[PDB]
Design a protein around this ligand. Structure first.
Ligand SMILES: CSC[C@H](NC(=O)Cc1ccc(O)cc1)C(=O)N[C@@H](Cc1ccccc1)[C@H](O)C(=O)N1CSC(C)(C)[C@H]1C(=O)N[C@H]1c2ccccc2C[C@H]1O
Ligand SMILES: C[C@H](CCC(=O)NCCC[N+](C)(C)CCCS(=O)(=O)[O-])[C@H]1CC[C@H]2[C@@H]3[C@H](O)C[C@@H]4C[C@H](O)CC[C@]4(C)[C@H]3C[C@H](O)[C@]12C
Length: 328
């Protein structure tokens, strides 16, 4: 019944999945990003160094290509790509639909991220009004065409050296989680954002905005909240970068607890530490960065999602959260 695209871990920090553009089935690797709402692929017309090692899109070889050519720039927090709109058949798992996407010709504003990673493009899994060009989300559009049961998708993330992951479209599969699945209502029209009380030891923020974001390989915390957490924690900031290093077994490292009237979600140090033995013996980096939004906000990124199976439900305007099964 449901369509299941396999997720591959890349250096236990990112994960990617593959999909196709064109009726000649041109293959691409995507970051799958719940926090954005446009699809893009690098073009054969790309003029920049970053495209050299990528799978490139050739509209001339697809009979289902429809020209648009409207110029567009996608601005991410990690950089900018530019190009123009094109329309073609997009295939995700076994499902296809004609889809508007961005043909990228300049990726120099997205370095060094682009050249250092093995993805080709980004496939947005956000809300329509967050898109450029008023593009209906893939999953919404697939439901509207009755190709899937429900306008929802789920993430069961891969775990480095343990199991593969899945982006599942159309339904919720019991095989991905254990214990209860708790639904948290979205608190915003166009982000996968929910309200949770956030506790880290003695520090807490009542009714914080929490964005569940598949494209962010960190937990982000308000900067003042982070500053309090790190006080007398025996961690050291990396020169010039917003990351902190610690002895891996530092017993002061706290557990994040997020609560709603419905549920309680925790994130222990094992889920947010990254070993860096090559930099030194028994050293870890915290996958936590300080970021201020206009309203106090946490991004519950990839470290959160490695622990917790997540359901993104457009029809019920909610995020479902459950403990991910350790193995399939
Ligand atoms: C609507 S369209 C995209 C939107 N535009 C904007 O907000 C407009 C904007 C542009 C520039 C700016 O100064 C501020 C604003 C954007 O970018 N939303 C992002 C989510 C986001 C949003 C706000 C804060 C943090 C992150 C997006 O969903 C996303 O996940 N991204 C952007 S590409 C990406 C898929 C590689 C990933 C990313 O960067 N990851 C790195 C990251 C990020 C943060 C911490 C550690 C690390 C490590 C890496 O994992
Ligand atoms: C989102 C905020 C922007 C704040 C702002 O806009 N003011 C900025 C400030 C510092 C930025 C990170 C660092 O640069 C290090 C690193 C470089 C990689 O290449 C891309 C990933 C990463 C983690 C960056 C992502 C993002 O871009 C951050 C969090």
């Amino acid at each position: 019944s449901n369509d299941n695209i396999e997720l591959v871990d890349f250096q236990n920090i990112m994960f990617y999945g593959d999909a196709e553009v064109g009726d000649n089935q041109q293959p691409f690797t995507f970051i799958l990003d719940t926090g954005s709402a446009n699809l893009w692929v690098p073009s054969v017309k790309c003029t920049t160094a970053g495209c050299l090692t990528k799978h490139l899109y050739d509209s001339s070889k697809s009979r289902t290509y429809e020209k648009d050519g409207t110029k567009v720039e996608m601005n991410y927090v990690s950089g900018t790509v530019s190009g123009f709109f094109s329309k073609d058949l997009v295939t995700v798992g076994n499902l296809s639909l004609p889809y508007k996407f961005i043909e990228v010709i300049d990726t120099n504003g997205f370095e060094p991220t682009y050249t250092a990673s093995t993805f080709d493009g980004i496939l947005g899994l956000g809300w329509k009004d967050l898109s450029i060009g008023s593009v209906d989300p893939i999953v919404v559009e697939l439901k509207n065409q009755n190709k899937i049961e429900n306008a929802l998708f789920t993430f069961y993330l891969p775990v480095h050296d343990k199991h593969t992951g899945f982006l599942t479209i159309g339904g919720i599969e019991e095989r991905f989680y254990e214990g209860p699945l708790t639904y948290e209502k979205l608190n915003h029209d166009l982000y996968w954002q929910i309200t949770l009380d956030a506790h880290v030891g003695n520090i807490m923020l009542e009714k914080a905005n929490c964005i569940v974001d598949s494209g962010t390989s960190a937990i982000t915390v308000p900067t003042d909240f982070l500053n309090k957490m790190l006080q007398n924690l025996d961690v050291i900031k990396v020169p010039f970068l917003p990351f902190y290093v610690t002895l891996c077994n530092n017993s002061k490292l706290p557990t994040f607890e997020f609560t709603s009237e419905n549920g309680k979600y925790t994130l222990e140090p094992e889920y947010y530490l990254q070993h860096i033995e090559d930099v030194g013996p028994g050293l870890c980096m915290l996958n936590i960065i300080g970021l201020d939004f206009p309203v106090p906000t946490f991004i519950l990124g990839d470290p959160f999602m490695r622990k917790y199976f997540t359901v993104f439900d457009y029809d019920n305007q909610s995020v479902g959260i459950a403990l991910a099964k350790k193995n399939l």
